[PDB]
Amino acid sequence: IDLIHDIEHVIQQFPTVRFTFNKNNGQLFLIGHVRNSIDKSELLYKVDALSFVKSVDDNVIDDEAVWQEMNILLSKNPEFKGISMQSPEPGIFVISGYLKTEEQAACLADYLNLHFNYLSLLDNKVIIESQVMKALAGHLVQSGFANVHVSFTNGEAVLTGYINNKDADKFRTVVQELQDIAGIRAVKNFVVLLPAEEGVIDLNMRYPG
Numbered sequence: 001i002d003l004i005h006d007i008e009h010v011i012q013q014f015p016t017v018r019f020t021f022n023k024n025n026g027q028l029f030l031i032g033h034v035r036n037s038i039d040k041s042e043l044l045y046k047v048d049a050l051s052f053v054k055s056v057d058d059n060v061i062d063d064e065a066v067w068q069e070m071n072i073l074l075s076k077n078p079e080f081k082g083i084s085m086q087s088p089e090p091g092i093f094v095i096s097g098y099l100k101t102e103e104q105a106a107c108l109a110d111y112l113n114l115h116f117n118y119l120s121l122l123d124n125k126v127i128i129e130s131q132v133m134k135a136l137a138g139h140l141v142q143s144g145f146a147n148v149h150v151s152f153t154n155g156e157a158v159l160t161g162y163i164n165n166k167d168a169d170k171f172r173t174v175v176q177e178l179q180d181i182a183g184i185r186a187v188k189n190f191v192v193l194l195p196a197e198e199g200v201i202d203l204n205m206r207y208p209g
Contacts, residue, residue: 007019017032028057030060035087040062070085079107092121094125096127099126105128157184160191161192
């Protein structure tokens with residue numbers, strides 16, 4: 001029982017790690033995930049140090065080898081090369097980046113189905129560009145700017161069109177709020193500010209050609 005407490009003192013430091021210890025032959029069987037091969041070596045050498053452990057059967061996954069391997073596969077795929085995988089902790093994988101459409105999103109899911117061994121542990125954070133653009137276009141319409149047109153690629157929103165000169169401060173506000181959405185890193189504003197036509201006609205009359 002002090003044996004159980006001694007193994008636990010070690011393995012508790014490596015969340016997800018589990019074991020079985022066979023007292024007939026002194027064998028420890030380990031399973032689960034660690035952050036990287038450095039953590040793995042720490043784990044193995046600490047359990048080995050336990051004087052009652054004669055052998056270690058090591059089935060622990062190095063999560064770093066796992067996501068690095070996957071990033072190598074995605075990198076070679078022209079469809080997915082802006083997509084990468086990480087792990088913010090043992091046993092949790094996170095896939096992130098931008099795709100253009102829902103169809104490319106479905107292609108990626110199929111791909112990961114065929115290539116990735118830990119789907120049940122995978123968190124999906126990929127941003128779909130076609131979706132972000134509906135969100136943006138809907139905010140502009142809500143606000144009275146239907147009017148202003150938007151494109152969106154790779155975290156970058158581009159605005160074009162024309163606004164009424166009166167509307168400058170309302171629009172500045174609408175642009176602030178578009179910055180605080182989903183996977184938006186930058187807004188590039190090319191919208192023209194129209195002056196009152198009557199005001200232009202009038203400056204045409206009082207200055208020489």
